Every structure is written in structure tokens, then in C-alpha cells.
From Swiss-Prot:
The keyword Disulfide bond does not apply. Belongs to the phage P protein family. The chain holds residues 119 to 192 of 233 of the full protein. Keywords: DNA replication, Host-virus interaction, Viral DNA replication. It comes from Escherichia phage lambda. This is Helicase loader. Loads (host) replicative DNA helicase DnaB onto single-stranded (ss)DNA at the origin of replication. Reconfigures the DnaB hexameric ring, generating an opening large enough to permit ssDNA into the central channel. Necessary for the bidirectional replication of lambda DNA. It interacts with the ori (origin of replication) region of the genome during the initiation of replication. It comes from the Viruses. Forms a (host) DnaB(6):lambda P(5) complex in the presence of ssDNA. The keyword Mitochondrion does not apply. One of its GO terms (biological process) is DNA replication initiation.
Length: 74
């Protein structure tokens, strides 16, 4: 299933920490297309907006609701 908000925020921070080891964002080791889209969107929003941890958590929760709805309808 999808990550919960805490799991997803941890993934964003790990990606933040590890992304320099890889040739590009797509080459990072994603367990699903969902993880790639969730994490890279939140990372870029983090980066381009200096999001606080609480702000990141709110965006992550919204992204997870949109993605749950997408998967729910096929």
C-alpha cells in the first residue's frame, strides 16, 4: 500500500540525504512509481519553498490523499 505521512516524510529526508549518490532522480531505488512521484514532488516543493518539517508533513498528507484517490479509481 501507500506510505503513511510519517513514513513518507522519512523517505523524503532519506532521498534528500542519498540523492547525490545516483545519476538522476529516476535512478534512485524506488519501490513503486508511487514512491518516485510522491517523494520527488515533495522534495522539489521542500527545496523550492524552504518548507519546515510541519509544512512538509501537511503537503505530504495532501499528496497522499490525492494519490489514494488516483489508485482507488484504477
Amino acid at each position: 500500500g501507500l506510505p503513511n505521512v510519517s513514513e513518507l516524510v522519512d523517505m523524503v529526508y532519506e532521498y534528500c540525504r542519498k540523492r547525490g549518490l545516483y545519476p538522476d532522480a529516476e535512478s534512485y531505488p524506488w519501490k513503486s512509481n508511487a514512491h518516485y512521484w510522491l517523494v520527488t514532488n515533495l522534495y522539489q516543493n521542500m527545496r523550492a519553498n524552504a518548507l519546515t518539517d510541519a509544512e512538509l508533513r501537511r503537503k505530504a498528507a495532501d499528496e497522499l490523499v490525492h494519490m489514494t484517490a488516483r489508485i482507488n479509481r484504477g
